[PDB]
Symmetry: D2
Subunit: 124 residues, 4 copies
Amino acid sequence: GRDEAGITGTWYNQLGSTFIVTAGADGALTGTYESAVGNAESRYVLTGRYDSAPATDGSGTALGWTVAWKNNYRNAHSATTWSGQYVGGAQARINTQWLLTEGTTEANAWASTLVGHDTFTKVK
Amino acid sequence: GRDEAGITGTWYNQLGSTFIVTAGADGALTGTYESAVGNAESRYVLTGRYDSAPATDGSGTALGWTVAWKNNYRNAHSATTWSGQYVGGAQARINTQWLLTEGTTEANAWASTLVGHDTFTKVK
Amino acid sequence: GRDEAGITGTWYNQLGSTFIVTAGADGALTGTYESAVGNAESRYVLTGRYDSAPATDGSGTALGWTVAWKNNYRNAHSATTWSGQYVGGAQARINTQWLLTEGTTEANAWASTLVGHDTFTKVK
Amino acid sequence: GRDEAGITGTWYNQLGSTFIVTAGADGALTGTYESAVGNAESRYVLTGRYDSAPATDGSGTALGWTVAWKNNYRNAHSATTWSGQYVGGAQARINTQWLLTEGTTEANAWASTLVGHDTFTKVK
């Protein structure tokens, strides 16, 4: 992948969360997520995809991943998906928007989904 | 997984797209996505996660998945993440919201991300 | 406005909420909103804007409005904005997506905003 | 309103856009928006609402507003709604998420809505 080397490794967001990812040559993302906030402790499995052959015109690299908030410690009956782009260079960044859906009854489904934005850096 | 059997198989959304998924006992989602609309043709790899031990109180099952819109035919330099819940029973449904990010330059990044909502059924 | 007549009146969404709006020739939307769900009772003031000179090519009419969830009965310390399009004709519809932000502390601001989608019809 | 004085005035976002607002004692927001990016020039009318009696516990003040992107110069057949909270003090901020819907045909409605996030400050 063009940004395989650039994406693979440890990232930190503005909340102090830790995103540990391996980018496969084939577009795969695999790793672990540790949230600094919410109904979470320790690492959770993540999986996703990225564009392994991005535009060569200075565009970012599109990518996304999911965490289901179940591990050996806790179950928050919820999943977050991050959707965004990798921007390479001296201060490389992953700029995301995310959707967090909780399991709800049908009557409460209007209130099921939070939306926010996370920015990941290699330092922090 | 509680809904492993319920989730695994072929789903269709309101646009006529086809979502082919296997739910692993361990929370994994793997499969293929075929979009009826946009800069896409044929199937794309998807991966995600779901809550393999949901609440037993009538709540849905939280889940999410990603598609990077690169395959052997086309590259739309973009990724969609669906975040939502599986609702079991006679008319089982996956109710989602999604974020579609395109690779952009830094100057165009304000305009990088579409948001929408898809509902998947076993028929259609 | 092209859709001034079409927009003005009483709308109902999929939750059974009631949206009472007047469209001004100048792009103004004014009226009241009554939610069937959440920390709400009776009517709340709404204001917004719409495109009073839409495309004549079969496109919908872009529009949006806000409700702050404070009235003489209750204060949910929150605001919803609906963003979407009016689609005219036999089964006229307002198709929206919405953002509901609650006042939070800085530490809880990651969890401040819900996202969803409402479809309004003239019947229901 | 508790934050009437705090909200009223000129704000600037991270794109260099200018948001000129008056907060009414009654929860009204009125003013003008000038975008630094997109299919826009000069000022556009905005209207919205805010919580005129927020929590006294250090929570932000919920608020929202709409711009329809039609003025005497241009018509982008679109509307943006910002939903977020005012945070008072030395570096006062309005933290928002926004939905931008364009008028579309029914076949293109899946692609109608952008989502992003703007942070407004009194300086810039």
